[PDB]
Design an enzyme around this catalytic site. Sequence first.
Site, PDB file in Angstrom:
ATOM      1  N   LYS A 207       7.131  10.681  42.432  1.00 58.76           N
ATOM      2  CA  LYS A 207       7.004  11.656  41.367  1.00 58.76           C
ATOM      3  C   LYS A 207       8.192  11.322  40.461  1.00 58.76           C
ATOM      4  CE  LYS A 207       7.228  16.553  40.183  1.00 58.76           C
ATOM      5  NZ  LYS A 207       7.488  17.965  40.600  1.00 58.76           N
TER       6      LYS A 207
ATOM      7  N   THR B 126      10.288  22.380  43.547  1.00 55.80           N
ATOM      8  CA  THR B 126      11.336  23.008  42.739  1.00 55.80           C
ATOM      9  C   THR B 126      10.790  24.289  42.083  1.00 55.80           C
ATOM     10  OG1 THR B 126      12.075  20.759  42.203  1.00 55.80           O
ATOM     11  CG2 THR B 126      13.180  22.560  41.089  1.00 55.80           C
TER      12      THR B 126
ATOM     13  N   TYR C  99      10.471  11.462  45.118  1.00 57.09           N
ATOM     14  CA  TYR C  99      10.736  12.319  43.964  1.00 57.09           C
ATOM     15  C   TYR C  99      12.057  11.966  43.257  1.00 57.09           C
ATOM     16  CZ  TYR C  99      10.884  16.776  41.318  1.00 57.09           C
ATOM     17  OH  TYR C  99      10.965  17.719  40.326  1.00 57.09           O
TER      18      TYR C  99
ATOM     19  N   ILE D 193       2.064  15.864  38.699  1.00 58.55           N
ATOM     20  CA  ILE D 193       2.480  17.079  39.394  1.00 58.55           C
ATOM     21  C   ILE D 193       3.046  17.872  38.220  1.00 58.55           C
ATOM     22  CG2 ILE D 193       3.985  18.023  41.224  1.00 58.55           C
ATOM     23  CD1 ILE D 193       3.762  15.208  42.543  1.00 58.55           C
TER      24      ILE D 193
ATOM     25  N   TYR E 139      23.315  16.528  44.700  1.00 59.56           N
ATOM     26  CA  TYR E 139      24.722  16.925  44.916  1.00 59.56           C
ATOM     27  C   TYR E 139      25.623  15.954  45.752  1.00 59.56           C
ATOM     28  CZ  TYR E 139      28.862  19.622  46.045  1.00 59.56           C
ATOM     29  OH  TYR E 139      30.185  19.986  46.147  1.00 59.56           O
TER      30      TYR E 139
ATOM     31  N   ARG F 281      18.381  17.026  37.672  1.00 68.52           N
ATOM     32  CA  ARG F 281      18.604  18.133  38.596  1.00 68.52           C
ATOM     33  C   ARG F 281      19.453  17.735  39.788  1.00 68.52           C
ATOM     34  NH1 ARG F 281      15.568  23.346  38.842  1.00 68.52           N
ATOM     35  NH2 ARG F 281      14.611  23.503  36.762  1.00 68.52           N
TER      36      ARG F 281
END
Lengths: 292, 292
Positions: free
Chosen positions: B161, B44, B133, B203, B107, B138
Site C-alpha cells: 500500500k 490508520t 504499507y 485502499i 517512530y 506518518r
Amino acid sequence: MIAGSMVALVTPFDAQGRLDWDSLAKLVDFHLQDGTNAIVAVGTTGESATLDVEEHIQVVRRVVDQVKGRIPVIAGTGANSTREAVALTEAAKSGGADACLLVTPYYNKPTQEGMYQHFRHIAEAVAIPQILYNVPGRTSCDMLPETVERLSKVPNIIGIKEATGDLQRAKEVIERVGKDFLVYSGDDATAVELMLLGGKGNISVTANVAPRAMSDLCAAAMRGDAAAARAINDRLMPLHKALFIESNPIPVKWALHEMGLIPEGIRLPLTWLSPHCHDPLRQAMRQTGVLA
Amino acid sequence: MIAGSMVALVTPFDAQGRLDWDSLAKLVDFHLQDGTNAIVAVGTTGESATLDVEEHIQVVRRVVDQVKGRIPVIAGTGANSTREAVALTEAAKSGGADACLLVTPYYNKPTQEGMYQHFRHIAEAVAIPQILYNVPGRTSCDMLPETVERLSKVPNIIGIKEATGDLQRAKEVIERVGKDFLVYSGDDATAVELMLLGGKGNISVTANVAPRAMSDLCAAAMRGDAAAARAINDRLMPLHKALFIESNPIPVKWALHEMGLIPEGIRLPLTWLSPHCHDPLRQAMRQTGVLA
C-alpha cells in the site's frame, strides 16, 4: 532537582534477545561514578518500542534500586494512545521513578488541541512530574510553542525535552514559558547553546560513551562559561555525529559494546551497526579518547 | 485477487468512547450493498493506535462474521516492535481475516535492512497473505523501492500500500516487481493515475462516504478509460481534499455522523472536527452529491 547532564540510557540485551541485568548494573555504576546528574531509563535510546510491559517496570525499578537515590531517575512512559500513556506512567510512579519523560503522540499526528487534551489528562491522572518530549523527526508531529506555553501551565508538568535542534525554537519557548518551567536539550550537537540561552540540561545520547565530559560541559554552560562549554563540545563533535551515523540507538549500542560494557544484542526491527559504519565510528571514539 | 475499491473502514465509538456494534454492522452493509471490493479493518482510519488488542480481534471477528466470506476482509496488524507484530497478525489470522496490512515500523526509524528482516520474519512466522504499507508522512521512516523489490520475492507477501502520493515512486515500484505482486494506492487524490500506471486498487478513505462512486472510478481506471477515470476523479477532488482538512480519521467521521451512519465519538489524542472545518466539508459532501 532535575537538571544538567542526563543520560538517555541504553537497555542491554544478550545475544539471544533477553535482558542482561549484570550489564545494566555496570552502566548505572559507570554513570554514577563519572558524574552523570540523572538517568532517563527506558526511553527512545532505551529501546522502549520493543520492550514488554513487564520488562518495562522490571528495569525502572532495578535502576532506582541501584541508585540509592543518589541521582534522579526519569522514566519514559509516552505512548501514542492517551490510555497506555496513563498506564505506563502509573507504572513508573510505582517502580520509584522521580519524574516521567513523555513523547508527543507518534503515527497518528494529533491536532494541537489534541496534544493539549492528551497531556493535560495524563497530568491529572498520575501525580508525578512530567517532562514533555518534542521530536517531529520521529513522530511526524511538531508541538508548536503556543501548545507548549499552554501546557507548561499545568500542575505537574515541569519541563520539555526539545529535539528539533532549531535554536530559534528554543528561545521562543524559553520566552513563552515561566521562570521555573524547564527546557532541556534533545539534540546533542546543539545542547551547549540551548543551555547558554537559558536551558537547564541535556538529555544526552553521547553521554552514554562519555558521561564525565558531558557533566563538565553542562556545568560550564549553565554557569554561563561559554568559553569552556564550547571547548569540550568541539572535542566531542566527532562523537556527536558518529553516534547517529545510523538511527539511534544502533550506533551508541555498538560503541558501548566496543568499550566492553554491553553485549552484542538489539531487537528487531532495529539491527546491528552495518559494517559500512564501523571504521567511521571506531575512529571517532579514538579521536575522542574513549578508545586507543 | 484482492483489488479495486477497498475501504479503510473507520471504527465507530459512542459519545463515551465505547465501540458501537450497531454502527459497524451498518457500515458493513453499506459497503456490502454498494459494492466495495474489500474492507480494511483496524487500519490508520480505523484508529488502530488506540485499541487494546482485545478490542482489536473483537472488531475483526464481528466484521469477518458479517461479511461471511463474500468479499476479502483485510486486517491492519503492524507494530513497530517485530514481536508485537507477529502477535497481532497471529491474532488477525485467528480471527478469520483473509490477509493483513502491515505498516513500516513508525517512530523507531529502521534501516532498510532492518525493515527487510522485520517483514520477512513476520511472513515466515504467520501463514497468511501480507500487504506492505509505506507511508512516510506518518511514520518518519521510508521503504525505498529498492527494499520493496527484495521483499516481493518472499512467499506470502503479495503487495504494497504505497502512500507517498509520489507518482514516480509508483512508476518505480511497479517497474521493479512482477505482475503478481500488487501495488495499491494509499493516497485518494492521486489513486486514479497510479492505477493507470499498472496499479491494481485503492485502499481508500473517500470510499467511506462515497463507496459507489469509488468503485466506478477504480473500474474505469483499471480497464483503461483514462478519460472516464479522470472525469470521475475531477468530480470527487473537493471531497478528497476535504477529508484531509484536519489530520486523518477526524474529517471522515464528522462526515459519517452527518450521514447518520456513526456516533459522535473519537478517541484521544484525536479530537472531533474543529468548528472552522464544518462548512468547507459540508459543502464538499453536497457539491459532490452524498449530502442534500
